[PDB]
């Protein structure tokens, strides 16, 4: 019935980066959460 | 391959203005 | 972005081989719908088909055991958990059984032989409603609607339609709701009574709705047609019934809720069993198993447990094996590529045969092996699909 | 007859010895877990007479054939169970055992023995000797599996995972590559060399053999073919039941695989710790050891690999005069040897 | 009649010394 | 004297000793009893033909 | 430190320990049943 | 996945731990064990103290999951992937229907010990129980696994009177079993005959009791197995000498005469169907009393220790066992002779003496390991396998469904395996500095021609021979039964030695085992080899133009063998020389 996953056949649909960061055509929260993993990285990194 | 229509066979073998020409032909008609 | 356009593409591209595959399926079924009227006048067909309570005939004291059984002549309701009888009558094929009936084991052996010889299969079909038809029809013609404008919007997924017709036209083999399918192995019997048990789930996992449930018996036999063609069959319907979750009425009866207690929780089997219902001395074994700090017994788990399907089956999906259960959709999707367009109807009049077919002479295109598949279509592209390998 | 006996047990759903512990029976990890006849032969001296599994891939395929006979076993259960209710029916013992000998020939249990066909009389002493014909078709229990494989399609796919295969053609490449550099580092050395002067040393002392006036007679009085020139095997003194068993067990264990290994360990070891816990817990330490042990497994090989070769440095990374400061010792394997060659 | 190895290109001329088939020199012509 | 026409001995190519047949599996080891079996039949079955 | 956390947990593995079993008599016909 | 003495949980409070129902006491834990059910439970303390053991162990996880450590913690080289991630979720996915599926597992196999009872199951409690529940749990327990009908009734009967005219005393937990046995009918000895079982069977199993001082349900089913025999003169010799006749007949004789007033036997007569046991109301006190006794009175001492002659006959008999084999076996050399045929020479002499007198040194071997061997098996059990304890168990398992168990746990665990390298992930530096390798396609990847089952068939089978034997050189396969076998021989024999080629393939590094594999393959290479010129004879002698099956035959080739074949490690001709493979693969 429902789930999280979307009903797609074709693994293209479900492809992701290896550190799950799919923020596109993602879904919503998934997109606002890889930002903000992103931007943790990141503010990490040009911090050190 | 074979029961493939011919746009679809010669899709497959790296033919792709004749697939484009092929296609638009087939649009018109 | 690529891979989603990709994801995308495949899928405007299963839809549009799907609406293709539609119209083979309805030709088809009219053809072998033509085929079988054709037939039953040359054959001799089931003239009667009843249902009947079960029976549970525990002779008392002074009983003696040679008296005959004593059943109902009808039932006007099937309960959604009930075990049920099912009355018919064929001709000679089983007579001569009824002959041969009057200690041997090579007598024993011939009459299991014959027993094997004979083949009946019991369905069950519930009249559609008109909203319910105009609901799907509503529905069907926005999806096929949809699959137009998909068609449109793309100027080559015409080649496709036309492709996947041709396809079917030469892959095919040349030639009122279906709800679930009870007892499919059901062989000739010498009493022509046969003991069925009704799922709460159907063939895909789904609750059977209200409505008026038909028995629809087809009879086989194998000395006309050893391949099992659908179209030969004898065919008899019963008079519709109606079907419907008792248990909560039931429930609400017994109860005048969350935690059945404790001490009243074993006279509730009692009161099912009177009520018609089954209930497994394991179903409630392990039921008892999950009670709280006082005792009580989970209402909501022992429900899941009765309505579960590991402790009965439907004698239907009894006979598969576990591992015709594991390639079942397999050869369902290969089945209906076979033969384009289908339904539960046909998938359960071919489901043992084809079934037997693959695990019997194949047994190696199905059954999965450990290095050519992929356990989850998110994970096997990574993980089990090194590059390396 | 004895046929008959044994489908006794195989539609019966007991096992056949009821768990008893037998001297002469061994309920290998294969063939089911189920009990197989494992007679301990005299002829050949102290040898159990039961085949002994010694690559894990050996156990991995019998696994496999069962996962892919586990259809078969369940048909004939139904069978078994059609079989069992006709047999209640049967009263008289006669009916019951001609229905069970018919059976017996229909479903080949007597052709699921491994008759021991020869006619050398020494093969047939070993065969007549700790493990007779009479005994084989006395004590021969059958088990379902082994009744399903006569009719039904044989495998062809070994259950063999990618990943596994991946892992076995490492371990493969890496033995080889490890034969391959110990063979050339004693080529470099010389050793080689010395034992073809030792053999060269000893062609002095060596004489020449008596080839005997008839060759021919000769050789074959050496082979034992001619009549009334046959000897007998010299005769061993076997070892204890103990030491018969334990190779055995051993080697069983040395082929079963790490994780199936560990699980039995595991579940074995719940019921003695101090501190039992449910399946929710015994998955995920069973699963932190299995990488833990196969880390370890991978520390150990390398530092075996580093400690027989000499590899990495001898002393401080940097010392008086350079870290390319090494003592090579004759005859002694060595990184600086390994990476000239 | 150190161990021999395993899988060795051996030399047309030599051998690995474990059985009369494969001495340490061979002796044979290679030729007919 | 004490053999006049009887048949040689069956000489079976590929003879493996206990310390081989050990490790034969339960189907190689019916394998081989097979092979060993069909083997001394055919060459009796020759030499009965030859006699 | 993957490797030390990895030996200490082979360590641990090991450091489980036995566990104080009790022992309930059967000789006769009945598997004398104890409560807690 | 379980040893001998294993602890399978059989509850379920997973189910309901979560829903914030824990036990904090002994008490509460123990009224949450028991089943308002029927056959509720009996347990013993060495079980008692491992359930709570479990249970605060859960406890402590579940509350540590909540708060959340043990619990979500990645390895220490991993990092942990963003919440609800594509593969996050479905890692998790699959990590719960593994946990569902070994928790259904355990739950099976703690079914199963409840079935087969062991001493942490001590016994059942069938006090209070309805019509159904006798019926049904009888059907499914004891009339599936009944061969035979008749030894229902005997056994029945049987436990009838040991339960009560042997022991009386008992632990005051059966007075409810002790009620229900008197209250069984039986029949007017002199219509109800069929209906019930006849009172001088039941008189007879009383003085089998009495006379062989039967105990437990173990020596029951002993004697009930072998009494019927015509042996059972012998083979039922109690370890203590049974009782002489008079004395139990005066017993039984007392027995009767008190049943009388308040109101030898050789052999039962014919006993009515088994089929009225579970239908009439008056044999209910009967069939409840056979459940009863089914479910109870199993003990752990092997009955062999007084019956050592019934060991041979319920069990298989011990192989080292002498005296009865080898005389029935008789002479060694006769049986050698025999076996060998009169067209093959007779045994001279001197190696006839010396067999003989080997068969006798083996004899006295045997004998002399008789007695030692069966103790120290024992120290072995002691300091793996399941069913295999020192103890006796009538209603062992098949071991069947304990390995399909076994295996649904281990790939499940598999599963579970994968599912954590998906769950989490490595460094991100770490992975970018990783790809800068870039696998070449060459030599850094893995070789195509990787060993595996249907590569060496299909090489196989790419033999011009092969294919033409396979095709067209048999008979067609559906035409004539003969053609069928031989295809499937034929096939069978293929299949074979690709096996053991794929099987050397995989042991080839190692050459302790190299060698003693390729003996098989040469084994089932001169099988095939065989085969294959027998019927290519057939097919060329059996009895013509355009290129004919005969022509087409002649025109291949002469078949080169594959007993004398090169292959090493792929299935291919070696690029060594000839000395050099023939020193590869030799026999050791």
């Given at each position: 019935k429902e789930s999280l996953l979307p009903n797609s056949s074709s693994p293209f649909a479900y492809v992701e980066d290896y550190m799950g960061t799919n923020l596109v055509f993602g879904s919503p929260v998934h997109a606002k959460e890889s930002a903000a993993v992103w931007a943790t990285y990141f503010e990490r990194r040009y911090a050190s | 391959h074979e029961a493939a229509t011919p746009w679809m066979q010669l899709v497959q073998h790296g033919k792709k203005e004749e697939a484009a020409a092929l296609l638009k032909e087939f649009e018109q008609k | 972005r690529s891979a989603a356009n990709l994801a995308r593409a495949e899928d405007l591209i299963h839809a549009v081989v799907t609406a293709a595959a539609q119209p083979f399926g309805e030709r088809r079924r009219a053809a072998t719908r033509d085929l079988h009227m054709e037939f039953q006048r040359l054959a001799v067909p089931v003239e009667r088909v009843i249902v009947a309570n079960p029976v549970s005939a525990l002779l008392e004291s002074g009983?003696?055991?040679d008296e005959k059984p004593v059943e109902g002549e009808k039932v006007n309701m099937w309960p959604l958990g009930a075990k049920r009888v099912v009355l018919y009558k064929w001709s000679a094929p089983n007579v001569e059984k009824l002959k041969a009936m009057e200690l041997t084991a090579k007598r024993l052996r011939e009459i299991q032989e014959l027993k094997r010889r004979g083949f009946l299969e019991v369905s069950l079909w519930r009249r559609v409603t008109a909203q319910e038809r105009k609901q799907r029809n509503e529905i069907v013609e926005a999806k096929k609607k949809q699959v137009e404008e998909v068609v449109r919007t793309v100027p080559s997924l015409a080649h496709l339609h036309q492709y996947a017709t041709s396809l079917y036209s030469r892959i095919e083999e040349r030639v009122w709701e279906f709800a679930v399918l009870l007892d499919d192995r059901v062989l000739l019997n010498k009493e022509e009574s046969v003991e069925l048990y009704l799922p709460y789930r159907d063939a895909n996992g789904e609750l059977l709705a209200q409505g008026e449930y038909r028995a629809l018996v087809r009879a086989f036999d194998l000395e006309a047609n050893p391949n099992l063609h659908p179209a030969y069959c004898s065919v008899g319907y019963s008079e519709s019934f109606q079907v419907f979750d008792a248990l909560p009425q039931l429930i609400a009866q017994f109860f005048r809720v969350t935690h059945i207690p404790a001490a009243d929780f074993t006279p509730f089997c009692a009161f099912l069993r009177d009520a018609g219902l089954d209930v497994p001395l394991r179903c409630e074994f392990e039921a008892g198993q999950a009670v709280t700090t006082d005792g009580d017994v989970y209402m909501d788990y022992f429900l899941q447990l009765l309505r579960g399907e590991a402790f009965h089956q439907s004698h239907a999906q009894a006979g598969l094996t576990e591992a015709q259960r594991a390639i079942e959709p397999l050869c369902r999707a290969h089945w209906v590529v076979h033969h384009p367009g289908a339904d539960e109807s046909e998938w359960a009049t071919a489901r043992r045969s084809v079934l037997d077919h693959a695990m019997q002479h194949?047994?190696?295109?199905?059954?999965?092996?450990?290095?050519?598949?992929?356990?989850?279509v998110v994970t096997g592209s990574t993980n089990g699909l090194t590059p390396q390998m | 007859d004895w046929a008959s006996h044994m489908q006794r047990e195989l539609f019966g759903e007991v096992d056949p010895l009821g768990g008893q512990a037998h001297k002469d029976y061994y309920r290998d990890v294969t063939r089911g877990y189920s009990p197989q006849y494992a007679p301990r032969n005299f002829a050949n001296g102290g040898a159990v007479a039961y085949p002994h599994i010694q690559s894990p891939y050996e156990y991995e395929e019998a696994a496999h054939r069962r996962v892919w006979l586990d259809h078969d076993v369940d048909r004939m259960r139904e069978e078994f169970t059609q079989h069992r209710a006709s047999l209640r029916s049967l009263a008289s013992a006669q009916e019951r055992e001609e229905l069970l000998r018919s059976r017996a020939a229909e479903y080949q249990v007597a052709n699921t023995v491994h008759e021991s066909e020869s006619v050398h009389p020494i093969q047939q002493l070993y065969n007549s000797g700790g493990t007779s014909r009479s005994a084989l078709k006395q004590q021969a229990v059958a088990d379902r599996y082994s009744i399903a494989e006569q009719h039904s399609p044989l495998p062809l796919t070994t259950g063999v995972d990618r990943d596994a295969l991946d892992e076995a053609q490492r371990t493969k490449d890496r033995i080889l590559n490890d034969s391959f550099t110990a063979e050339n580092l004693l080529i470099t050395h010389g050793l080689r060399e010395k034992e073809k002067h030792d053999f060269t040393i000893l062609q002095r002392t060596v004489r020449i053999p008596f080839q005997g006036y008839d060759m021919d007679r000769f050789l074959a009085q050496q082979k034992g073919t001619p009549y009334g020139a046959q000897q007998l095997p010299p005769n061993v003194v076997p070892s204890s039941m103990e030491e018969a068993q334990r190779t055995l067990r051993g080697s069983s264990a040395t082929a079963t695989p790490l994780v199936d290994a560990v699980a039995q360990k595991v579940y074995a070891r719940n019921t003695v710790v101090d501190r039992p816990a449910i399946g929710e817990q015994l998955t995920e330490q069973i699963i932190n050891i299995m990488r833990a042990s196969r880390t370890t497994a991978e520390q150990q090989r390398e530092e075996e690999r580093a400690q027989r070769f000499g590899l990495g440095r001898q002393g401080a990374l940097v010392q008086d005069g350079g870290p390319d400061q090494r003592t090579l010792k004759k005859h002694t394997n060595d990184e600086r040897i390994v990476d000239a060659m | 009649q150190a161990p021999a190895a395993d899988l060795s290109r051996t030399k047309p001329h030599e051998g690995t010394g474990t059985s009369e088939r494969d001495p340490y020199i061979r002796t044979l012509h290679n030729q007919r | 004297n004490h053999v006049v026409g009887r048949a040689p001995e069956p000489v079976v190519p590929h003879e493996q000793p206990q310390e081989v047949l050990r490790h034969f599996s339960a189907e190689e080891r019916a394998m081989y009893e097979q092979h060993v079996k069909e083997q001394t039949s055919r060459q009796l079955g020759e030499w009965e033909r030859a006699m | 430190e993957v490797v030390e956390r990895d030996a200490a947990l082979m360590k641990k593995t090991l450091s489980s320990g036995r566990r104080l079993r009790h022992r309930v008599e059967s000789s006769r016909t009945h598997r004398n049943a104890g409560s807690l | 996945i379980t040893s001998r003495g294993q602890f399978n949980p059989?509850?379920?409070?997973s189910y309901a731990m979560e829903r914030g129902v824990r036990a904090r006491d002994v008490k509460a834990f123990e009224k949450l064990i028991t089943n308002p059910g029927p056959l509720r439970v009996a347990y013993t303390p060495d079980y008692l103290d491992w359930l709570h053991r479990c249970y605060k162990a859960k406890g402590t996880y579940m509350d540590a999951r909540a708060v959340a450590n043990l619990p979500g913690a990645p390895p220490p080289g991993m990092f942990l992937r963003p919440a609800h991630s594509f593969r996050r979720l479905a890692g998790e996915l699959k990590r719960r229907r593994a946990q569902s599926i070994l928790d259904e597992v355990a739950r099976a196999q703690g079914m199963l010990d409840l079935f087969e009872r062991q001493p942490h199951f001590p016994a059942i409690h069938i006090d209070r129980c309805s019509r159904f529940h006798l019926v049904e749990l009888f059907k499914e327990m004891v009339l599936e696994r009944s061969l035979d009908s008749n030894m229902i009734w005997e056994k029945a009967l049987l436990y009838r009177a040991i339960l009560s005219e042997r022991k009386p005393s008992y632990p005051t937990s059966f007075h409810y079993i002790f009620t229900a046995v008197e209250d069984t009918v039986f029949a007017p000895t002199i219509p109800l005959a069929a209906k019930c079982p006849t009172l001088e069977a039941y008189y007879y199993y009383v003085y089998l009791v009495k006379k062989y001082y039967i105990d437990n349900a173990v020596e029951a089913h002993v004697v009930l197995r072998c009494h019927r025999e015509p042996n059972a003169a012998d083979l039922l010799f109690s370890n203590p000498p049974p009782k002489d006749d008079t004395e139990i007949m005066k017993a039984v004789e007392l027995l009767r005469n008190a049943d009388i007033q308040r109101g030898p036997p050789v052999l039962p007569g014919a006993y009515p169907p088994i089929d009225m046991l579970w239908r009439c109301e008056e044999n209910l006190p009967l069939l409840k009393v056979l459940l009863f006794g089914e479910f109870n009175l199993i003990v752990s001492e092997n009955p062999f220790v007084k019956f050592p002659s019934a060991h041979g006959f319920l069990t298989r008999p011990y192989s080292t066992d002498s005296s009865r084999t080898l005389a029935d076996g008789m002479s060694l050399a006769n049986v050698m002779a025999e076996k060998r045929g009169h067209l093959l020479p007779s045994l001279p002499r001197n190696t006839a003496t010396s067999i003989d007198a080997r068969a006798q040194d083996i004899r006295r071997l045997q004998q002399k390991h008789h007695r030692d061997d069966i103790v120290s098996f024992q120290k072995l059990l002691r300091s793996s396998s399941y069913s295999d304890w020192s103890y006796f168990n009538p209603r062992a398992v098949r071991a069947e469904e304990r390995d399909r168990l076994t295996r649904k746990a281990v790939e499940a665990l598999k599963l579970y395996d994968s599912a954590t390298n998906d769950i989490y992930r490595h460094s991100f530096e770490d992975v970018q500095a990783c790809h800068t390798q870039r696998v070449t396609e060459r030599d850094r990847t893995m070789p195509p021609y990787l060993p595996t089952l249907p590569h060496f068939v299909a090489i196989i089978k790419k033999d011009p021979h092969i294919s033409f034997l396979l095709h067209i050189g048999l008979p067609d396969r559906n035409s004539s039964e003969e053609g069928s076998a031989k295809h499937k021989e034929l096939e069978k024999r293929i299949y074979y030695l690709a096996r053991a080629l794929y099987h050397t393939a995989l042991e080839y590094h190692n050459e302790t085992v190299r060698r003693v594999n390729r003996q098989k393959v040469n084994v089932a290479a001169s099988l095939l080899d065989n085969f294959v010129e027998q019927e290519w004879t057939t097919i060329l002698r059996d009895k013509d133009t355009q290129n004919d099956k005969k022509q087409l035959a002649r025109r291949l080739g002469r078949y080169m063998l594959f007993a004398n074949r090169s292959l090493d490690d792929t299935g291919f001709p070696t690029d060594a020389r000839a000395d050099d493979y023939t020193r590869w693969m030799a026999p050791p």
């Open positions: - | - | 009983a003696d055991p194949e047994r190696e295109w199905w059954f999965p092996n450990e290095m050519l598949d992929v356990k989850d | - | - | - | - | 059989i509850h379920n409070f």
